[PDB]
Tab-separated table of C-alpha atoms in Angstrom:
chain	number	residue	atom	x	y	z
A	1	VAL	CA	55.640	31.391	27.659
A	2	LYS	CA	54.421	34.093	25.771
A	3	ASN	CA	57.003	36.546	27.754
A	4	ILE	CA	60.084	34.073	27.030
A	5	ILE	CA	58.914	34.368	23.146
A	6	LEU	CA	58.681	38.171	22.798
A	7	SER	CA	62.397	38.731	24.255
A	8	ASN	CA	63.770	36.756	21.359
A	9	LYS	CA	66.865	34.864	23.200
A	10	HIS	CA	65.685	31.188	23.775
A	11	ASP	CA	63.807	28.513	22.187
A	12	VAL	CA	60.737	27.636	23.338
A	13	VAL	CA	60.106	23.641	23.037
A	14	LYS	CA	57.350	21.371	23.869
A	15	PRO	CA	57.245	18.552	25.751
A	16	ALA	CA	56.749	16.306	23.519
A	17	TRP	CA	60.248	16.226	22.382
A	18	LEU	CA	61.120	15.626	25.801
A	19	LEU	CA	58.628	12.398	25.752
A	20	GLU	CA	60.573	11.627	22.037
A	21	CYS	CA	64.106	11.699	23.394
A	22	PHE	CA	63.276	9.600	26.585
A	23	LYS	CA	61.546	7.286	25.010
A	24	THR	CA	64.651	6.987	21.933
A	25	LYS	CA	67.038	6.962	25.019
A	26	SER	CA	69.338	9.890	22.672
A	27	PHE	CA	69.728	13.089	21.808
A	28	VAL	CA	66.873	14.068	18.586
A	29	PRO	CA	67.551	17.250	16.110
A	30	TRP	CA	64.644	19.455	16.765
A	31	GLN	CA	62.321	20.165	14.295
A	32	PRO	CA	59.922	22.906	13.301
A	33	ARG	CA	56.910	20.700	15.120
A	34	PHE	CA	59.015	20.868	18.461
A	35	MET	CA	59.570	24.632	18.382
A	36	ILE	CA	57.142	26.838	19.860
A	37	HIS	CA	59.370	29.799	19.257
A	38	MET	CA	62.956	30.123	17.482
A	39	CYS	CA	65.931	32.221	18.072
A	40	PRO	CA	66.976	34.304	15.194
A	41	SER	CA	70.381	31.746	15.453
A	42	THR	CA	68.168	29.071	15.498
A	43	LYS	CA	65.590	30.518	12.808
A	44	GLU	CA	69.079	31.253	10.469
A	45	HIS	CA	69.732	27.591	10.856
A	46	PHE	CA	66.091	26.290	10.187
A	47	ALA	CA	65.971	28.452	7.224
A	48	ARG	CA	68.506	27.480	5.349
A	49	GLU	CA	67.569	23.469	6.047
A	50	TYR	CA	64.132	23.659	6.257
A	51	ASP	CA	61.215	25.998	4.611
A	52	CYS	CA	59.373	28.659	6.167
A	53	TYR	CA	56.440	26.328	7.028
A	54	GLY	CA	57.128	22.417	8.511
A	55	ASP	CA	58.745	21.251	5.742
A	56	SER	CA	62.005	20.244	4.982
A	57	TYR	CA	64.087	20.124	1.454
A	58	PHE	CA	66.369	17.389	1.982
A	59	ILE	CA	64.245	14.604	4.041
A	60	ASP	CA	61.419	13.337	2.473
A	61	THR	CA	57.863	13.817	3.321
A	62	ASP	CA	55.360	11.022	4.305
A	63	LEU	CA	51.661	11.440	4.741
A	64	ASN	CA	51.375	12.300	8.454
A	65	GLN	CA	54.373	14.648	7.960
A	66	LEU	CA	52.694	16.184	4.654
A	67	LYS	CA	49.315	16.374	7.276
A	68	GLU	CA	51.651	18.261	9.633
A	69	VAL	CA	52.477	20.725	7.225
A	70	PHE	CA	49.296	21.635	5.808
A	71	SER	CA	47.737	22.020	9.276
A	72	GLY	CA	50.913	24.572	9.615
A	73	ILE	CA	49.941	26.688	7.072
A	74	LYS	CA	46.659	28.666	8.071
A	75	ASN	CA	44.106	29.216	5.449
A	76	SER	CA	44.007	32.125	2.777
A	77	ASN	CA	41.812	34.086	0.915
A	78	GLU	CA	44.142	35.683	-1.940
A	79	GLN	CA	42.477	33.397	-4.322
A	80	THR	CA	39.549	33.804	-6.883
A	81	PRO	CA	37.316	30.424	-8.244
A	82	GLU	CA	37.808	31.090	-11.520
A	83	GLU	CA	41.767	32.070	-11.650
A	84	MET	CA	41.671	28.958	-8.831
A	85	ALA	CA	40.216	26.540	-11.152
A	86	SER	CA	42.117	27.638	-14.070
A	87	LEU	CA	45.457	27.413	-11.809
A	88	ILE	CA	44.444	23.676	-10.736
A	89	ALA	CA	44.051	22.906	-14.398
A	90	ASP	CA	47.406	24.295	-15.195
A	91	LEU	CA	49.018	21.782	-12.370
A	92	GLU	CA	46.551	19.038	-13.731
A	93	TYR	CA	47.749	19.062	-16.880
A	94	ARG	CA	51.480	19.781	-16.018
A	95	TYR	CA	52.013	16.451	-14.377
A	96	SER	CA	49.555	14.251	-16.242
A	97	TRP	CA	47.063	14.201	-13.855
A	98	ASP	CA	44.024	13.773	-16.308
A	99	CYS	CA	43.343	10.251	-15.359
A	100	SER	CA	41.550	10.851	-12.128
A	101	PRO	CA	38.400	10.003	-11.929
A	102	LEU	CA	36.481	12.694	-10.060
B	1	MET	CA	-22.275	24.545	-7.173
B	2	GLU	CA	-21.409	22.227	-4.614
B	3	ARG	CA	-23.123	19.051	-3.986
B	4	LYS	CA	-23.656	16.897	-1.026
B	5	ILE	CA	-25.384	13.040	-1.089
B	6	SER	CA	-26.106	11.562	2.620
B	7	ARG	CA	-28.127	8.994	3.897
B	8	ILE	CA	-30.892	9.145	6.573
B	9	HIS	CA	-33.338	6.850	8.185
B	10	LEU	CA	-36.545	8.562	8.808
B	11	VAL	CA	-37.940	7.794	12.292
B	12	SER	CA	-41.645	7.179	10.685
B	13	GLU	CA	-39.861	4.495	8.239
B	14	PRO	CA	-37.032	3.120	9.784
B	15	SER	CA	-36.973	-0.251	7.645
B	16	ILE	CA	-35.610	1.512	4.731
B	17	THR	CA	-33.047	4.546	4.051
B	18	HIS	CA	-34.029	7.992	2.327
B	19	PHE	CA	-30.939	10.068	0.144
B	20	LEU	CA	-30.930	13.651	1.169
B	21	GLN	CA	-28.959	15.601	-1.427
B	22	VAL	CA	-28.162	19.538	-0.581
B	23	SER	CA	-26.770	21.888	-3.106
B	24	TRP	CA	-25.287	25.255	-2.401
B	25	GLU	CA	-23.564	28.238	-4.743
B	26	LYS	CA	-21.069	29.391	-2.350
B	27	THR	CA	-21.881	28.453	1.072
B	28	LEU	CA	-24.423	27.094	3.240
B	29	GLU	CA	-25.308	30.336	4.679
B	30	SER	CA	-26.284	32.071	1.105
B	31	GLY	CA	-29.118	29.221	0.953
B	32	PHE	CA	-29.047	25.700	-0.445
B	33	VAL	CA	-31.168	23.148	-2.206
B	34	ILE	CA	-32.408	19.786	-0.539
B	35	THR	CA	-33.720	16.863	-2.119
B	36	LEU	CA	-35.439	13.877	-0.392
B	37	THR	CA	-35.650	11.016	-2.732
B	38	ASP	CA	-35.980	7.142	-1.325
B	39	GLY	CA	-36.432	5.527	-5.301
B	40	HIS	CA	-39.921	5.890	-6.062
B	41	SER	CA	-40.581	9.900	-5.161
B	42	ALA	CA	-38.721	12.766	-4.197
B	43	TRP	CA	-39.560	16.144	-2.715
B	44	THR	CA	-37.755	19.385	-3.623
B	45	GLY	CA	-37.373	22.225	-1.243
B	46	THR	CA	-35.559	25.589	-0.790
B	47	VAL	CA	-34.165	27.196	1.849
B	48	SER	CA	-33.085	30.947	1.846
B	49	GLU	CA	-30.469	33.222	3.513
B	50	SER	CA	-33.735	35.032	5.430
B	51	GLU	CA	-35.413	32.004	6.523
B	52	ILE	CA	-31.758	30.663	7.597
B	53	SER	CA	-31.707	34.386	9.820
B	54	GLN	CA	-35.032	33.776	10.954
B	55	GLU	CA	-34.508	30.433	12.249
B	56	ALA	CA	-31.313	31.761	13.783
B	57	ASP	CA	-32.820	34.390	15.570
B	58	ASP	CA	-35.426	32.475	16.912
B	59	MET	CA	-33.393	30.092	18.574
B	60	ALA	CA	-31.147	33.003	19.550
B	61	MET	CA	-27.430	31.980	18.863
B	62	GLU	CA	-24.564	33.240	16.115
B	63	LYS	CA	-25.289	32.158	12.756
B	64	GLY	CA	-22.068	31.033	13.138
B	65	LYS	CA	-22.822	28.158	15.333
B	66	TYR	CA	-26.479	27.367	13.295
B	67	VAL	CA	-24.528	26.892	10.059
B	68	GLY	CA	-22.123	24.602	12.262
B	69	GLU	CA	-25.060	22.529	13.629
B	70	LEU	CA	-26.446	22.710	10.001
B	71	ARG	CA	-23.209	21.499	8.515
B	72	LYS	CA	-23.056	18.496	10.735
B	73	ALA	CA	-26.555	17.354	10.404
B	74	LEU	CA	-27.671	17.759	6.721
B	75	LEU	CA	-24.365	17.510	5.549
B	76	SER	CA	-23.335	14.246	7.907
B	77	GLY	CA	-20.347	16.022	9.680
B	78	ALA	CA	-21.665	14.230	12.928
B	79	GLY	CA	-19.036	13.786	15.543
B	80	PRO	CA	-18.059	10.985	17.432
B	81	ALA	CA	-21.071	11.607	19.826
B	82	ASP	CA	-24.229	13.622	17.808
B	83	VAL	CA	-27.809	12.124	17.101
B	84	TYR	CA	-29.897	13.494	14.678
B	85	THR	CA	-33.200	12.497	14.254
B	86	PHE	CA	-35.264	13.458	10.800
B	87	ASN	CA	-38.803	13.567	10.408
B	88	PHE	CA	-41.021	13.733	7.444
B	89	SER	CA	-44.679	14.053	7.541
B	90	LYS	CA	-45.434	13.050	3.653
B	91	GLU	CA	-49.015	13.497	3.872
B	92	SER	CA	-48.099	17.698	4.653
B	93	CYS	CA	-45.086	17.246	3.089
B	94	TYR	CA	-43.418	19.165	6.106
B	95	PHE	CA	-39.526	17.561	6.647
B	96	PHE	CA	-37.657	19.148	9.706
B	97	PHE	CA	-34.537	17.657	11.907
B	98	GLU	CA	-33.775	17.967	15.231
B	99	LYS	CA	-30.773	17.323	17.497
B	100	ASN	CA	-31.143	14.460	20.387
B	101	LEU	CA	-29.095	14.693	23.681
B	102	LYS	CA	-29.956	12.350	26.169
B	103	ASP	CA	-34.081	12.911	27.284
B	104	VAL	CA	-34.387	16.107	25.567
B	105	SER	CA	-34.218	17.184	21.909
B	106	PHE	CA	-33.844	20.258	19.993
B	107	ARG	CA	-35.954	21.055	16.721
B	108	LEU	CA	-32.931	22.499	14.754
B	109	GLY	CA	-34.362	22.853	11.531
B	110	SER	CA	-37.646	22.316	9.695
B	111	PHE	CA	-38.674	23.051	5.804
B	112	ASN	CA	-41.823	22.467	4.047
B	113	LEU	CA	-41.354	20.833	0.723
B	114	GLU	CA	-43.523	19.862	-2.486
B	115	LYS	CA	-43.236	16.707	-4.255
B	116	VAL	CA	-41.962	16.489	-8.131
B	117	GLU	CA	-43.836	15.101	-10.891
B	118	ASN	CA	-40.814	13.357	-12.281
B	119	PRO	CA	-38.698	11.763	-9.325
B	120	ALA	CA	-37.091	9.853	-12.370
B	121	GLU	CA	-35.398	12.626	-13.466
B	122	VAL	CA	-33.887	14.130	-10.487
B	123	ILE	CA	-32.789	10.088	-9.375
B	124	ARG	CA	-30.946	9.688	-12.490
B	125	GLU	CA	-29.400	13.185	-12.250
B	126	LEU	CA	-27.772	11.955	-8.682
B	127	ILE	CA	-26.949	8.600	-10.212
B	128	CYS	CA	-25.452	10.293	-13.306
B	129	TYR	CA	-23.417	13.287	-10.945
B	130	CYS	CA	-22.101	10.293	-8.344
B	131	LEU	CA	-20.579	8.163	-11.413
B	132	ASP	CA	-18.802	11.597	-12.718
B	133	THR	CA	-17.408	11.976	-9.466
B	134	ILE	CA	-16.547	8.492	-9.206
B	135	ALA	CA	-14.833	8.571	-12.065
B	136	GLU	CA	-12.857	11.955	-11.677
B	137	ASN	CA	-11.859	10.582	-8.017
B	138	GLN	CA	-10.487	7.438	-9.923
B	139	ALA	CA	-8.504	9.198	-12.181
B	140	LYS	CA	-6.927	11.426	-10.210
B	141	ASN	CA	-6.027	8.451	-7.716
B	142	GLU	CA	-4.314	6.515	-10.624
B	143	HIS	CA	-2.436	9.784	-11.194
B	144	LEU	CA	-1.339	10.090	-7.806
B	145	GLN	CA	-0.236	6.854	-7.782
B	146	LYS	CA	1.766	7.067	-11.277
B	147	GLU	CA	3.579	10.470	-9.425
B	148	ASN	CA	4.318	8.575	-6.419
B	149	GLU	CA	5.996	5.464	-8.177
B	150	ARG	CA	8.110	7.939	-10.558
B	151	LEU	CA	8.943	10.151	-7.054
B	152	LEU	CA	10.087	6.587	-5.313
B	153	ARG	CA	11.795	5.414	-8.210
B	154	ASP	CA	14.007	8.588	-8.630
B	155	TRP	CA	14.756	8.920	-4.913
B	156	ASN	CA	15.671	5.072	-4.838
B	157	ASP	CA	18.288	6.278	-7.806
B	158	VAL	CA	19.338	9.737	-6.087
B	159	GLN	CA	20.130	7.514	-2.663
B	160	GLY	CA	22.643	4.999	-4.556
B	161	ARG	CA	24.071	7.999	-6.603
B	162	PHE	CA	24.477	9.669	-3.231
B	163	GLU	CA	26.060	5.992	-1.941
B	164	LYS	CA	28.625	5.982	-4.363
B	165	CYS	CA	29.741	9.660	-4.551
B	166	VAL	CA	30.242	9.714	-0.748
B	167	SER	CA	32.727	7.166	-0.712
B	168	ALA	CA	34.334	8.325	-3.653
B	169	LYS	CA	34.720	11.781	-1.747
B	170	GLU	CA	37.163	9.296	0.606
B	171	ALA	CA	38.527	8.114	-1.787
B	172	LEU	CA	39.694	11.557	-3.766
B	173	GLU	CA	40.590	12.857	-0.083
B	174	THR	CA	43.579	10.232	0.014
B	175	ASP	CA	44.042	9.861	-3.196
B	176	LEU	CA	45.650	13.559	-3.137
B	177	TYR	CA	48.081	13.714	0.130
B	178	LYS	CA	49.541	10.477	-2.093
B	179	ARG	CA	49.832	12.366	-5.273
B	180	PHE	CA	51.125	15.689	-3.751
B	181	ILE	CA	53.964	13.549	-1.849
B	182	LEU	CA	55.133	11.642	-4.915
B	183	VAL	CA	55.240	15.054	-6.580
B	184	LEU	CA	57.144	16.826	-3.355
B	185	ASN	CA	59.364	13.930	-3.328
B	186	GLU	CA	60.382	14.414	-6.694
B	187	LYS	CA	61.091	18.019	-6.697
B	188	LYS	CA	63.268	17.609	-3.344
B	189	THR	CA	64.915	14.320	-4.975
B	190	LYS	CA	66.136	17.805	-7.714
B	191	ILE	CA	67.198	19.803	-4.858
B	192	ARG	CA	69.394	17.096	-3.357
B	193	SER	CA	70.924	16.654	-6.566
B	194	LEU	CA	71.637	20.335	-6.878
B	195	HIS	CA	72.980	20.114	-3.614
B	196	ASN	CA	75.325	17.769	-4.073
B	197	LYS	CA	76.483	19.381	-6.961
B	198	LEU	CA	77.108	22.376	-5.246
B	199	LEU	CA	79.114	20.885	-2.414
B	200	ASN	CA	81.121	19.122	-4.611
C	1	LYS	CA	33.703	18.129	-1.569
C	2	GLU	CA	34.952	21.117	-3.778
C	3	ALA	CA	36.114	23.156	-0.629
C	4	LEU	CA	37.616	20.343	0.735
C	5	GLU	CA	39.708	20.275	-3.183
C	6	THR	CA	40.511	23.900	-3.139
C	7	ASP	CA	41.634	24.229	0.021
C	8	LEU	CA	44.211	21.505	-0.338
C	9	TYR	CA	45.158	22.299	-3.724
C	10	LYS	CA	45.609	25.495	-2.710
C	11	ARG	CA	48.306	24.576	0.654
C	12	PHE	CA	50.036	21.604	-1.918
C	13	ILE	CA	50.446	25.060	-4.718
C	14	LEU	CA	52.040	26.720	-1.610
C	15	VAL	CA	54.478	24.180	-0.686
C	16	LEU	CA	55.278	23.426	-4.292
C	17	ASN	CA	56.045	27.417	-5.329
C	18	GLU	CA	58.615	27.514	-1.792
C	19	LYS	CA	60.123	24.376	-3.312
C	20	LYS	CA	60.512	26.518	-6.629
C	21	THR	CA	61.668	28.900	-5.264
C	22	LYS	CA	64.434	27.000	-3.299
C	23	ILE	CA	65.270	25.482	-5.985
C	24	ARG	CA	65.596	28.638	-8.397
C	25	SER	CA	67.784	30.091	-5.739
C	26	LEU	CA	70.310	27.296	-5.610
C	27	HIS	CA	70.366	27.471	-8.812
C	28	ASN	CA	71.215	30.635	-9.327
C	29	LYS	CA	74.860	30.076	-7.394
C	30	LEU	CA	75.641	27.573	-9.985
C	31	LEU	CA	76.887	31.083	-12.155
C	32	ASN	CA	78.899	31.961	-9.423
């Protein structure tokens, strides 16, 4: 699988995709969740329809889907406590989130 | 000036209990003043470091062990199985104490006490000291009880606050995702509108 | 709790910035 991934000429799909296809007895479109690798053509196809992460631009998001999207993004340490707090406060103020109890 | 009062039963007069008061400055090793009373007469004597050292040398043992035995005997620090016999010759005012062990006894120590012309003064001093220490201990116990009650109340309040906050944590955890979903759905609706306009 | 809130907010704001860049890129084509 690693060798196939390194050679960017094929798409690597998790077995869950085939299991779901069998469950619904139909061809389900690809999603970033099922794709372990993306060929340049598939990468270009997903770039327009889908965000760089496992999130989409057209189809809405649900609780589970947002949880998976947040799982894909890994924690980063480019922020600072003070600036992070300022950004959080600005975000709450902009969208009127001052009614929260916490 | 540490002091210790104990009750003993002399073999000569086992029907009554005598009171032995031992007062020392820093430690029993340096020396101590003992006073034996019975409510009517008192006998006061003193023991110095030289006397203790001589007694330890005569009994041929380390000073530490002798001091420990003296503490166990005079200060009423006896263990679960330790019998001490105190004899006092009033005519000669000779007070000695020994350790009983099965069928053998060891003459642990001996002193020559002398009568005091005013036993009433020493009796009154002892009673006053006892009352003072009783009052001090009662005050300390009351203060400790108050502190314990305050600590218990504060602990209960903090426990309740923690109980509320632990659930508030999960409440916020659940609320944040829903808020993010709503805002992202609005943004994606704007995206869809713009895409449809471009397609048109 | 503070760590969890900070992590969730950072993830959400990053996703929102990605959406905003997509919005801006799509709007840039209107003038064309």
